[PDB]
Design a binder for this molecule. Structure first.
Ligand SMILES: CCCCCCCCCCCCCCCCCC(=O)OC[C@H](COP(=O)([O-])OCC(O)COP(=O)([O-])OC[C@@H](COC(=O)CCCCCCCCCCCCCCCCC)OC(=O)CCCCCCCCCCCCCCCCC)OC(=O)CCCCCCCCCCCCCCCCC
Ligand SMILES: CCCCCCCCCCCCCCCCCC(=O)OC[C@H](COP(=O)([O-])OCC[N+](C)(C)C)OC(=O)CCCCCCCCCCCCCCCCC
Ligand code: SF4
Ligand code: SF4
Ligand code: SF4
Lengths: 96, 70, 155, 176, 55, 357, 293
């Protein structure tokens, strides 16, 4: 955090070396920033989580994940609804 | 900041500097001290050939002063 | 071991290929003028080093930005043909990605995918400058993880 | 009220013509161009380092969407279908069902992320603040299928982006 | 701002204009990014009497 | 000798899908129409719809419309001149000014929440309020904006190469221009004393002081001068606007056209019902046929909207200023050398977004 | 070891050709509030390596309607020329002290027009044909101003021997006697200047033109014993000129062709003739004719 730097460059970062089983020493992306600090870093507010942490809730992820595209952990879409027009069940018997 | 240009210009300045320094130093070396004698006219050239002939070692830059003559 | 050498030569080659792209920009719609906003000083898409125009033959990545109508359909495909390998295209914006706000229109192909293969899908209407610059960084990392020379030695 | 933009005439006195002849013979207005950019050269750049720091945003920012849930953990969506009706690109497709408990919420919620236009009508349409766009913008992909969202992915983002959504909507519910 | 006096008088002279009076980028002149809570006003029909929508 | 342009390379069925979306859903199309200026297009569509609705916006909305209408004028005019600058060369003014557009994009970001396609101006006013402290930053940027524009003039006004490449190169006479349906800079560049803000002041433009930079000759240099003096004559408008910003509600107090406040929605039922119906089918515009045009930053943008009497527009035809401008490309590119055509479209100010519809 | 001296020139010039590009982009960058290449290596030091090896790995596509023979020898000449006029430069002591160095510089630098002419013809495209036609006529128009300026400059020098230039200047920079010609000369140098090659060819021309302008107009003192004094002065002068060469690259709208010919044949050529007339009689006028030997 700084005030001497101009607007948009006053708050900044360097990234960690390990990020959820992924070495980060040369490559960098913008998605490792956790949501609690994603507000502070993007100059969307002025109260860092150290000064003002987010309200704790159960469904909130305890481990933020970065962007996952290009890895074996991708996203794959699929139908969320249920099967309709269900195939008529045929009986067997021997025969007539 | 504006002074980050200098690392860019410095290396090529050395890249431009090397041809000049190398040419001057090799001139001092292959001519052994005295710089490469320049012969823009046939007078200077036949002077050089006289120096090469008089040296006795077929090296124009070898010079024989007062110690040579009797 | 030859496997180690082919790995080092792989790393040496693509490090350039992940640091010296040249984008042939296809200025179509509001996503296109938004790109030039990225090349503006506020974001400096030239500091990584990819020139804003880059010309047709002097280009690596073709950023498809804007609505892709069938009017421009054959012109882009002929352009993509002329783009020398290695060539990648980054579909920018909802219109170029799947059709966006004109998906059901009669005079636009639904998505730039149906015309050319795409390496990076950056979403937005328009995508914010860094949101596409990050996509460029995503393409940058996508170049890091290629096994070109490694596959050749494996074969 | 109108103002002329080119009606000035050059005076033909010796001083003015000397100015003109001096202007063109030995270029000065062009040298003034050199001086201006030289001052620009000896000036700080305005180029931020991505992703080490990025340009400022606002609490009203509309980006990647995410369904939310009540403090109890119960989902906010009630399948009122307002968002689908207003969705200008018809990127919302939802199907409701009488859930076994009796709250009867949605079964399907697919946002066609490559059809959406980030207009923000969906969030204002929702009467229970269920669908909101998170401040994220770096969610690009290499596959078209990744962009096509669904109920599970939407719920996951709400579980992921929750500090920002709660805080941004807390800084904005008085505004809208 | 940062930039010393020597660089300053170079950029003022080369431009011929006092650039330090106002910069093209903001150091500290902006509103604090978070804001105190607001109170929105009301309009001509937030009354309970003689506001029949018919007229 | 031939200057017939092949256009439609951008064409989308804008009017066709407008016919099937409701008025509220129809709004974002105009933001996407001109891909150089976003918000001033919303002014045209909104002004038409309220006129048919016989509903006027509150005075608070009117001043916000003109304030963002002017910042759009700066936005379009920065892009128009800088892109003009780029195609000739001269990349430095293109970069220097585009830094300032980032400030105004952040201004758009602070109000609408989106960078470009604000969708902020709606029939009945502006949907969201002005965030606290927003106008101060407008004052900050506007104070420094004039200084930047002199830097543009200092590099550009007296530059002989630019001037010579833009004096008398491309010229249209008064009657040919005005007969060709020209508008915006070209009628003013040719010397015609016409401007929609002064002759037919819409919204709140009557209560503001400015001048219309017209010029003689009619070539593109004066058109370049016309835009630049519009920048300054714009800057005085924002200076008066943020000096005289009145207090009031952002949208009309008519719930049938303006969705109620979120607090009202979750408390009072008629707010819930009206918002429900406003967000299922919306307001029903009474039948009519109005062509309302406004002084768009690049020209005269108009919409001819016929209303079926239901919650959807029967047909809405967009008067794209560049569509008439590009139609005269033959006239303003007659005789000049080939290298000057790109300059002509540079001063013709054609954005493919609206000419190709 | 004379061969080693050639590599001690060609390669560093080749690297010098390689490495001022980062100077260009960062100067052009920092000029427009930008930063230039600074993420690849420290301050873009490795940016030139980031592009060159990428370029050599890129397949060189060849047009279907392209004559391969001309398409590959035109760069051969283009690079051969661009690294040949570096040889007679009087930098400390020149590699070749040709008594007619100025003539050799002009004849071989005027030969560069063949490369662009062949490239347009061999490419066989409507764009390439006119672009070659425009480039060559712009170029072939501008040796007449080049030759006259250099000719009229050399009246007060003494000969075409490039090494003699140092002796002529010595006391003062030669611009102070021909500053109307310096602006006459400098402007003309701007316009006169496979695809992987064409970066190298014109680019060495850019630096050497400024190196040529450096010795011609802004000389230095060459101490017979210590040569490093002339080395630093020569490099510093040719750097300042090149920075100016890119200073104007992003400071003016580019010239248009009809003005480009009009500027020379109607406002540059007639004035160049007058200055040549002024500088042919003035050595006679003041009895200051110089010695050739
Ligand atoms: C050519 C001119 C002479 C050399 C440069 C002189 C110089 O930089 O003077 C400081 C300063 C730099 O410009 P500025 O805009 O005033 O900088 C404001 C702050 O220093 C702005 O803060 P800052 O950026 O100076 O603070 C950090 C900075 C600290 O930077 C410095 O302290 C500058 C000195 C170089 C380091 O260090 C870095 O940024 C790290 C990266 C360094 C990049 C590589 C530098 C290579 C220098 C040359 C090496 C040989 C070639 O210039 C002057 O004080 C006057 C103009 C130069 C006069 C030189 C003497 C005549
Ligand atoms: C006793 C004295 C004897 C000698 C006296 C000599 C005469 C007096 C002085 C005459 C003027 C100065 C000398 C000639 C200069 C050029 C004359 C000319 O034609 O000018 C008008 C010319 C043409 O101007 P024009 O085209 O607008 O007008 C010319 C006149 N008509 C209209 C009739 C055609 O100017 C140019 O060409 C503009 C510059 C073009 C190049 C763009 C880049 C410029 C970069 C400038 C900065 C860098 C300078 C570097 C200098 C060298 C450094 C080492
Ligand atoms: S995705 Fe949105 S911003 Fe991009 S071109 Fe399409 S409509 Fe325009
Ligand atoms: S923002 Fe996207 S999802 Fe929401 S209503 Fe608009 S188009 Fe539909
Ligand atoms: S997200 Fe909101 S508007 Fe959409 S169906 Fe659920 S409750 Fe209704």
């Amino acid at each position: 955090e700084d005030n001497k730097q101009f607007f948009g460059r006053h708050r900044w970062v360097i990234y960690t070396t390990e990020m959820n089983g992924r070495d980060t020493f040369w490559d960098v992306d913008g998605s490792m920033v956790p949501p609690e600090w994603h507000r502070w870093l993007h100059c969307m507010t002025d109260d860092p989580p150290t000064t003002k942490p987010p309200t704790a809730r159960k469904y909130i992820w305890t481990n933020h994940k970065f962007n996952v595209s290009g890895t074996p952990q991708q996203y794959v879409p699929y139908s969320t609804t249920r099967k309709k027009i269900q195939e008529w069940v045929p009986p067997s018997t021997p025969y007539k | 900041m504006w002074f980050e240009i200098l690392p860019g210009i410095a290396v090529m300045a050395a890249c431009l500097f090397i041809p000049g320094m190398a040419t001057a130093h090799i001139h001092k070396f292959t001519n052994g001290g005295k710089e490469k004698r320049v012969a823009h006219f046939s007078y200077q050239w036949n002077l050089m050939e006289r120096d090469r002939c008089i040296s006795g070692v077929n090296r124009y830059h070898v010079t024989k002063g007062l110690e040579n003559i009797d | 071991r030859g496997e180690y050498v082919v790995a080092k030569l792989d790393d040496l080659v693509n490090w350039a290929r992940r640091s010296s792209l040249w984008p042939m920009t296809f200025g179509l719609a509001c996503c296109a003028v938004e790109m030039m906003h990225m090349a503006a000083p506020r974001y400096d898409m030239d500091r990584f080093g990819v020139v804003f125009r880059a010309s047709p033959r002097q280009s690596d990545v073709m950023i498809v930005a804007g609505t892709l109508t069938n009017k421009m359909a054959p012109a882009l495909r002929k352009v993509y043909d002329q783009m020398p390998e290695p060539r990648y295209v980054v579909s920018m914006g909802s219109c170029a990605n799947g059709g966006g706000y004109y998906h059901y229109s009669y005079s636009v192909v639904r998505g730039c995918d149906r015309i050319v293969p795409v390496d990076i899908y950056v979403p937005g209407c328009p995508p914010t400058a860094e949101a596409l610059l990050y996509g460029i960084l995503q393409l940058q990392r996508k170049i890091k993880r290629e096994k070109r020379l490694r596959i050749w030695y494996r074969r | 009220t109108y103002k002329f933009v080119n009606m000035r005439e050059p005076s033909m006195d010796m001083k003015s013509v000397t100015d003109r002849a001096a202007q063109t013979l030995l270029w000065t207005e062009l040298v003034r161009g050199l001086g201006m950019t030289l001052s620009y050269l000896f000036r700080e750049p305005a180029t931020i380092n991505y992703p080490f720091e990025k340009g400022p945003l606002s609490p009203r920012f509309r980006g990647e969407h995410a369904l939310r849930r009540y403090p109890s953990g119960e989902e906010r969506c009630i399948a009122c279908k307002l968002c689908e009706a207003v969705c200008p690109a018809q990127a919302i497709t939802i199907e409701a069902e009488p859930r076994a408990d009796g709250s009867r919420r949605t079964t399907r919620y697919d946002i066609d992320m490559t059809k959406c236009i980030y207009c923000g009508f969906c969030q204002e349409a929702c009467p229970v603040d269920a669908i909101v766009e998170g401040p994220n913008f770096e969610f690009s992909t290499e596959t078209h299928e990744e962009l096509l969202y669904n109920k599970e992915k939407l719920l996951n983002n709400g579980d992921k982006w929750e500090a920002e959504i709660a805080a941004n909507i807390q800084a904005d519910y008085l505004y809208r | 701002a940062s930039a010393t006096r020597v660089i300053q008088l170079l950029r003022n002279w080369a431009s011929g204009r006092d650039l330090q009076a106002k910069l093209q980028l903001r150091y500290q002149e902006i509103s604090k990014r978070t804001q105190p809570p607001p109170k929105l006003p009301v309009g001509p029909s937030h009354k309970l009497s003689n506001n029949y929508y018919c007229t | 000798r031939k200057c017939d342009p092949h256009i439609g390379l951008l064409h989308r069925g804008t009017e066709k899908l407008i016919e099937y979306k409701t008025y509220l859903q129809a709004l974002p199309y105009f933001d996407r129409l001109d891909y150089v200026s976003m918000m001033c297009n919303e002014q045209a569509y909104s002004l038409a719809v309220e006129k048919l609705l016989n509903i006027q916006p509150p005075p608070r909305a009117q001043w916000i419309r003109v304030l963002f209408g002017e910042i759009t004028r700066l936005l379009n005019h920065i892009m128009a001149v800088t892109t003009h600058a780029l195609d000739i060369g001269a990349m430095t003014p293109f970069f220097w000014m585009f830094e300032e557009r980032e400030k105004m994009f952040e201004f758009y970001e602070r109000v609408s929440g989106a960078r470009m396609h604000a969708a902020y101006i709606r029939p009945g006013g502006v949907h969201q309020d002005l965030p606290l402290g927003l106008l101060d930053d407008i004052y900050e940027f506007s104070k420094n904006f004039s200084f930047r524009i002199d830097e543009l003039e200092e590099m550009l006004t007296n530059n002989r190469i630019w001037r010579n490449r833009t004096v008398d190169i491309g010229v249209v006479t008064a009657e040919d221009a005005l007969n060709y349906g020209f508008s915006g800079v070209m009628l003013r560049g040719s010397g015609i004393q016409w401007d929609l803000r002064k002759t037919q002041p819409y919204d709140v433009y009557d209560q503001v002081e400015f001048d219309v930079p017209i010029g003689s000759r009619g070539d593109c240099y004066d058109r370049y001068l016309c835009r630049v003096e519009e920048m300054r004559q714009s800057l005085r408008i924002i200076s008066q606007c943020l000096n005289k910003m009145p207090p009031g509600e952002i949208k009309v107090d008519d719930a049938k056209v303006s969705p109620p406040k979120r607090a009202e929605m979750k408390t009072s039922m008629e707010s819930l019902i009206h918002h429900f119906k406003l967000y299922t089918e919306g307001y029903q515009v009474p039948p009519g046929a109005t062509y309302t045009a406004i002084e768009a930053p690049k020209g005269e943008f108009g919409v001819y909207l016929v209303s079926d009497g239901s919650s959807r527009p029967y047909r809405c035809k967009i008067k794209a200023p560049g569509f008439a401008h590009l139609a005269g490309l033959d006239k303003m590119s007659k005789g000049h050398m080939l290298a000057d055509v790109v300059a002509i479209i540079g001063t013709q100010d054609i954005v493919f977004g609206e000419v190709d519809r | 070891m004379f061969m080693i001296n050639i590599l001690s020139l060609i390669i560093p010039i080749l690297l010098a050709v390689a490495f001022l590009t980062l100077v260009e982009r960062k100067v052009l960058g920092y000029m427009q509030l930008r930063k230039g290449p600074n993420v690849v290596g420290p301050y873009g030091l490795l940016q030139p390596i980031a592009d060159a090896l990428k370029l050599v790995t890129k397949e060189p596509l060849r047009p279907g309607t392209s004559s391969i023979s001309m398409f590959i020898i035109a760069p051969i000449l283009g690079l051969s020329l661009a690294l040949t006029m570096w040889v007679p430069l009087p930098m400390p002591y020149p590699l070749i002290n040709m008594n007619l160095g100025v003539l050799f510089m002009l004849a071989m630098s005027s030969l560069a027009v063949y490369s662009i002419l062949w490239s347009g013809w061999a490419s066989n495209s409507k764009y390439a044909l006119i672009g070659a036609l425009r480039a060559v006529a712009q170029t072939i128009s501008y040796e007449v101003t080049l030759a006259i300026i250099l000719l009229s400059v050399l009246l007060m020098n003494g000969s075409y021997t490039l090494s003699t230039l140092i002796t002529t200047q010595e006391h003062i920079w030669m611009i102070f006697t021909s500053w109307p010609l310096a602006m006459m000369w400098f402007i003309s140098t701007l316009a006169e200047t496979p695809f992987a090659m064409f970066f190298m060819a014109e680019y060495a021309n850019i630096i050497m033109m400024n190196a040529f302008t450096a010795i011609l107009f802004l000389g230095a003192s060459h101490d017979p014993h210590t040569p490093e004094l002339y080395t630093i002065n020569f490099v510093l002068k040719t750097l300042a000129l090149t920075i100016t060469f890119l200073w104007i690259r992003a400071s003016y709208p580019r010239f248009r062709y009809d003005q480009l010919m009009h500027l020379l044949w109607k406002s540059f050529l007639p004035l160049t003739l007058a200055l040549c007339m002024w500088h042919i009689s003035l050595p006679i006028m003041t009895a200051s004719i110089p010695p050739q030997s």
